Structures are given as structure tokens and as C-alpha cells.
Design an enzyme around this catalytic site. Structure first.
Site, PDB file in Angstrom:
ATOM      1  N   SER D 146       1.048  -1.107   0.046  1.00  0.00           N
ATOM      2  CA  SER D 146       0.073  -0.049  -0.089  1.00  0.00           C
ATOM      3  C   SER D 146       0.923   1.269  -0.053  1.00  0.00           C
ATOM      4  CB  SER D 146      -0.736  -0.045   1.254  1.00  0.00           C
ATOM      5  OG  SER D 146      -1.416   1.400   1.329  1.00  0.00           O
ATOM      6  N   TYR D 159      -3.454  -1.573   9.583  1.00  0.00           N
ATOM      7  CA  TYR D 159      -3.437  -2.069   8.048  1.00  0.00           C
ATOM      8  C   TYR D 159      -1.947  -1.837   7.603  1.00  0.00           C
ATOM      9  CZ  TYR D 159      -4.323  -2.486   3.106  1.00  0.00           C
ATOM     10  OH  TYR D 159      -4.147  -2.320   1.658  1.00  0.00           O
TER      11      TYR D 159
END
Lengths: 247, 247, 247, 247
Positions: D146, D159
Site C-alpha cells: 500500500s 493495516y
């Protein structure tokens, strides 16, 4: 120096090696140091007395990390200690608690993996989460990482991943906590002699051709934790003696 | 603190703003500070007297940078000053001299480009080259860079490129000089108020929502230049108040 | 593949080694390739004919880089070539032109320094500046850098600084040009065999234990220049075979 | 293109969004694609038929990730599928399986944390470990990370930490696997529309001022997985449309 006069510090795994030198440096500059330990009571008492002998104030804080209710236990025991004493707040959090896993990927078991993540990532995350209720303005969060998060070291891969995860936390919180004048930094040690061919590769991985000492790390951490590093935040501070520099 | 007791420092563009605070911080910790200037004699004399008033020792060093024989002139004037006095060696080199070029690519002229490269890259390179003959063991090279080398700022592109080039020098020399216990670091300031909508974007680019002060940079540089940062080398040290952190 | 069908590319130093493989890869995928050269006419003609033999279109463009009026000359000669032909616009700029300077700091002369900066930084900067008037939407700027900008290699320090400066340009322009769907990327080769103990250290610096080939770089550049890399911008793309990875 | 002619790929979470586009791109270039899914059988069957309709070959592989015996189950089901068929080996591993946790630190529970680490870190680690017995020379490991691992995004901190840990694996394995001509890369998507003020901040975080599409990521992954990216290893490949570039 007296750079931490009037402040309260907590150093997870503060009882020995790097943890211990940090605890000592901070306490020598006026910080009241909560010396956390999970297993080694005598080492904690050792570090505390050492500090008190030298004329600082510190106290032991017992919490087994990587077990259900670790973070709660830690902060329960921190408060128990300060209660009827300095208030419940702190200035300086140092995430130094860690366990090694010197196995390359082919040999890492679920048990060993889960253990290293529990201690190295999950524990510090929930310790920090619960820290934010108590952390004063101009405060300091300092995570002790490893050179191996930014320099490929296959033989300790699962350990490095555990520290990698905690490195993502530093910039996230430096952004979130910035408005309150709190800095969040990572300090990444290299290869440090604490208390055959491996020792040689690790000494010469430094451009200075030696292993680090605990004092090498503790000197950088003491700076990051001072008002002098107030303009330094979200950073990965290399305390490795120039590991990974060339080739 | 007295962290630089007995040491000799040279600060290029040491006469004002960041240069001046560095000169002052170092001289306040016992360093003998060569305050370099290219144009502004009175500002140099100002900084030196200030230092002497406060009870440090410093002296002026005149050399116009980005002109043929700049580096030679600088070191000629440094020696002239120490001669029959402290020996010809130094402990701490700070490359602070710089000129701005606030033009995006479409508007940068050859004259302006060549001027910024001459002052910001070519001058410090040959100043450092000639420094290595004089630089003692446990010494310090500290280049003052910009946040804009690592965070895209199109409106000052040619300036940033000039600082980018000097950032490559830091890791190169930290590797070459490592065996002699010399550290080479970059300290990157952000946006600093020295002596409309721009001022607003630059204040809020910090996670602390202010411009830097000269003291913010000088506090980090004073650390990097101390024995406390001896385990820190080849690094790009962020002194920007967390510029470029989020989005 | 035919990924560059209908597009116009310019490759500075496109006549041989990496320049040549890029020119060839792009022309093999339908790009009309302006093959720039500064000295080596026959090599340019060689590369062009090679391309034409294989059934692509390319043409020579003469401009001595690192001399007053280099950028103007280049673009004057590009237009002269397309005039009364494809319009004055281009899709793909590759800054491949470069000269080496294998001297550590102690041995770099002003003449050699100024020469490498003139060719490696100043030329590509003003070539790019003048490119922006002609560069179409969805266009590509690709700078060919070196592994030595991000991995300390003291023995080529001044060369690395020249490429460092150009690396700052990539993110600056990716931000400025983003709204027009133009990507700006750096591709950093390692150590590449083109047309004693050195050759050994450079082969084994790769995790694959060989030198790169021109085709290794040209395959990455061809991707970056395609619509497939449209979501990739401001990046430093490592084409070194994993140089600097471990230690 | 037919870049993956004769190869076997496994895409974890290959049933939809980014997973699905990757599966499709690879299968369209000749790869036999094992489409992994943990919950969504119909979506898996959907993706497989789609691929078969278009004239590629793919098959479903069921394994609930972040449960005891996930990795074993996955590889048990991969082999069961190829058995009496293509041999037990694979060329291309894509770690795409992931779950989100959009909570800042103050709101992350142990249950949610443990769930995200189990799926996002622990599952891919043991999937990769067990992959190395089967992974052929010139093979590819590609982890889907990410933008938030390298750009501070407090609101998804836990996350990001999960993806951070997996990013440490890439350079470790690129070093270990290098001698066998296997590349290990991370591809980091930004903010991608798959199948109020949030949507606006995420579109404009790109220098192109839009959200990514699955195809944007899948085009980069298809390259990294090809022989064209053979000289690209240990890298964090930015597929974010220039997220975090400026400020």
C-alpha cells in the site's frame, strides 16, 4: 546535561543491554525512569539501584510482553507506582522490548513467528495506543528498530518484519501527534555487543569496523528525547555505524 | 554543554540566519569558529563579536563563493588566521553557504543556473576536497541541504538539484572517511524564518504548523557535530518539522 | 509489442551502449526515434541504419553537450529534421547522454568536475526545459541515472553528484506535469558491459553475480515509456540487478 | 503480448478487484493462473470462467487465510489441482490477499489487529516459505503492499503496519533468491476504485487527480512478473499515481 529535568520516561525492556543504557542515560539527565521488564526481576532491580546509586530516580515495572493483557498490565503497574506520589502522565516512551529470531524463512515455525510478532509488534502497538491518553505536549515516542528493516539480512527475516511493522507506526503518529508538539521517531541500532565468522561480518558491516555499544544507541536516543530534537519527527534515525552504506 | 571543547569548526555562510545560529551554538560549546562570508563583512564581524561578547572565540574568513579560486581563497584565509596562533587542522566542517533560485523550470536562465551550481555544489565540493588534508580523526562533515531534495517542490527545482548533488557526497565520504572515525551527514532544513499565500503553505507544510527558526537547525547540527552522534554517519537528517510526512 | 506505435522519442546519447539499445527497443515498438549524438557521427548513422534495416524509422540529431548553446542546438536540429515531414511535438524524452569521471575526491580537477556537470546535469536540464513546450499529454520523461546516486561509491563521487542533481528533477516535474498525464521517472542502471579486480567487484555487486547488459536497461525504459507505466511517476526505478541490496 | 507463455502463476485473493485484474492480465499473456479465494466461491468461479471465456486457462484454489493451517491448505489445494495434469512447480507468486482496517490507533481492538496481521502478514509469510520448495529459476515473487507503508496515513495505521512487515520480506528474499535468477518485488497500489470527503482527498492525493483502477496495478504487476523486469529486484514499485510526491 540535565536535558530531561522534571520529565517521566518509560523504557520497555529497560533492564539490560540497550534498554539499560537508555534508562541510565535518561535518568542521568534528570528523567524519572520507569524500567520495564517481562522476565528478569533481578536485572530490573540491578538497573534501578545503579541509577539510584548515581543519584537519579527510577522504579521497576513488571509486564510479560506477548501475552494476553500485556499492555494493560504494563500501564496498570506504571500507575500503581506513581499513585499517591508524580502524576499519571509521561513525556518519553521508548519501545526497546524485543526478542530475536535468527532463522531464515525455511526454518521459521508458526510458534516462533507468533512469539516474535506478539512481543515486537503487538505489545508495543497496544502499549503506545494506551500511552496516548497519558502523553503530555512536547512528548517523545521513540521506537528501537534494527538496521535489518532497511538492509536485507535474510538470516533474521521474521525478526526484521516484526520491526518493519513498528517502523510504519512512526510516521503515522508523527503526523497525528504533530499538532501537540509530540515527536515520533525510530532509532535503528546495527549489530551491538551487550553483556565465529558472524562476529566478523557484523563488526566489518560498520564503516568504522566495530560492533556498536549500548552507549552508541543511548546517546542518539537521549538526543531524540530532548528539546534539541523537537524539529525532528517521523524519522528513521540510523544508529548502526553506517551499516549498508556502500558496495 | 561544552561538547566541542578544544575543537576547531568552519561554517560556510556562517555570518547570518542558519549559518549564524550554527556558528553561535558551536562557539557556545567551546568550538573555535571560523565564520566564513562571501559578501557581508559587517554581518561576519557582527556574528564574531556576538560570540566573543558571550565568551566564545571565533574569527572572520572572507571568500566569495562561485568564483574561480573560491575554495583556495577560503582555505588560504583560514590558515592565514590560525598561523602563529591553534594548528592548521579542523574537527567540524559545516557547508551552510547557499543562494536560492525561486524559479520553476520554464523561467530558470543559464546565468541563474550556473550561479546556483557554482555556489551551492562546486564551491562546497572543492572546499571539502581541500578540507580532507586538514580534517582530524573523529572529525565531522555536515552539509546543510533542503527538504526540497526529497519532497517535490517544482517552484525551486534548480536550487533543489544543486542541494541534491551535494547530498550524494554525504554517503560517499561517510564510506571513504569511516576508518578514521569521521562522520559525514546531511542536515536538511525545511522552511525557516531568518532575519502572502507562500508563508501560509510553508508554515502548514510542517506537522507542527509553523516555520522553522535558525535555532531548530543549529540544535540538530550541534548534536551531529558532537561525540554523541559518532554512531550516526552517511545520513540525511530531517530538520524540517515533518515536512512531506503525510497526504 | 508495438507499444509506442505513432509516438516520437528522443534519446540523448542514443548512438551506442545503453543509448543504442533504448533507441532500438523504442523503434522496434513503432516509435520514431531521434538518435542524438555529440561526437560520434558514424555510431549515430550505425544505430539509425540498424533500426531502418529492422523496419523501424529513426534519424540522427547532432548536438555537442556541455558547450554554450547545446540545448538550443539539439532542439534546432530535431525540428530541422521533422520540418515539412511528423509535427514538432514528442511523446518520450530519454536523458541518456553522460560522461564518466572515475576519480575519488582527492583527484577531481575543476576542469573534469565542470565538464561532467556541463554534460550530465546542465545539458539535460535545459534540454528538458525546452522539451516542455513540445511534450504532448500522456508523454514520458525518463532520466538514466546510476546505482551510485543511492549506493556510496567514493571512487566516482563527482559523477554520482552530477546524476544526483538530475534525480531531484524527476519528482519535481512528475508533480508539475501530472495534470497533463505526463510521467517523469529515473531509471538507474548498475554496472553495465557495453561495446581487473574492478570487473569482479562490479559483477558480484549484483545479487545475480553478473554485469548488466544494455538490453537489461532498455527493457525497463521501454516499459516506463509505455501506457502500462502510466500509474508510475516521480520514481527512481532500480535497473542494477539488486546492487546495494544486502550486507 | 504472450509474455507468460508456459508459466504457472498463483494470485492470492485473485477472485476480484486488483486480485482479479492481475489474474486476468497474467492469464491473457499465457500464464496458467491459480485463482485463490478464502470466502467468495462464486467470485472465484466468476474470474476463472471469464479467463476461460477469453481463451486462457485458470483454476480455483480455496484457502481461508488467517486461520491455523491456511498456508498448508492453500498449497494442498494447488497440488490437488495440478496433480495428474502441469507439474507441482510455479513461476509467479502474487501476494494480493488482504483485509482493510480503517481505524486510527485509539479505536483498533486486539481482535481487529490480530485478524489483520493473521491475513496480511502471517498468511503471506508461510505461503511464501512453502512456495520456495516449488518456485522455479527465473521465478517471480510479487507482494501487493500500500502507498500508506511509505506515506503517513494515521486513519489506517494497523493495516499499514501489516503491509510494512511484508515489505521487509521483499529485499530479504531478493538477496537470498538472487543466485537462482528469481526476482522479489513489492508493488504498492494507492487508492483504487474496485467493484464523501474521503473519495475527494484520495482522488486528489494522486498528481493525476483520480483514483487508480485495478488495470493500473495489474499492468505494473504483469511487467514485474515478465522477463523484461529480470534486472529489477528487491524493489518497492510505486503504483499510486504519484501519491505522497509533493507538499
Amino acid at each position: 546535561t540535565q536535558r530531561h529535568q522534571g520529565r517521566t520516561a518509560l523504557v520497555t525492556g529497560g533492564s539490560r543491554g540497550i534498554g539499560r543504557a537508555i534508562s541510565r542515560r535518561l535518568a542521568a539527565e534528570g528523567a524519572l525512569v520507569a524500567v520495564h521488564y517481562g522476565h528478569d526481576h533481578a536485572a530490573a532491580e540491578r538497573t534501578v539501584k545503579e541509577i539510584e546509586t548515581d543519584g537519579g530516580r527510577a522504579f521497576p515495572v513488571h509486564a510479560e510482553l506477548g501475552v494476553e493483557g500485556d499492555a494493560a498490565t504494563l500501564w496498570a503497574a506504571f500507575d500503581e507506582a506513581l499513585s499517591g506520589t508524580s502524576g499519571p502522565g509521561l513525556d518519553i516512551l521508548v519501545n526497546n522490548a524485543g526478542i530475536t529470531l535468527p532463522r531464515p524463512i525455511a526454518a521459521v515455525t508458526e510458534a516462533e513467528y507468533d512469539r516474535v510478532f506478539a512481543v515486537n509488534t503487538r505489545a508495543p502497538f497496544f502499549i503506545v495506543q494506551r500511552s496516548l491518553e497519558r502523553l503530555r505536549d512536547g512528548g517523545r515516542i521513540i521506537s528501537i528498530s534494527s538496521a535489518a528493516t532497511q538492509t536485507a539480512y535474510p538470516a533474521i527475516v521474521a525478526y526484521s518484519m516484526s520491526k518493519g511493522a513498528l517502523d510504519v507506526l512512526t510516521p503515522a503518529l508523527a503526523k497525528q501527534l504533530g499538532p501537540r508538539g509530540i515527536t515520533v521517531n525510530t532509532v535503528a541500532p546495527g549489530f551491538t555487543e551487550t553483556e565465529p565468522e558472524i562476529r566478523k561480518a557484523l563488526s566489518s558491516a560498520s564503516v568504522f569496523g566495530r560492533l556498536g555499544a549500548p552507549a552508541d544507541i543511548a546517546d542518539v536516543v537521549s538526543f531524540v528525547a530532548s528539546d534539541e530534537a523537537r524539529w525532528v519527527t517521523g524519522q528513521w534515525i540510523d544508529a548502526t555505524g553506517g551499516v549498508g552504506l556502500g558496495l
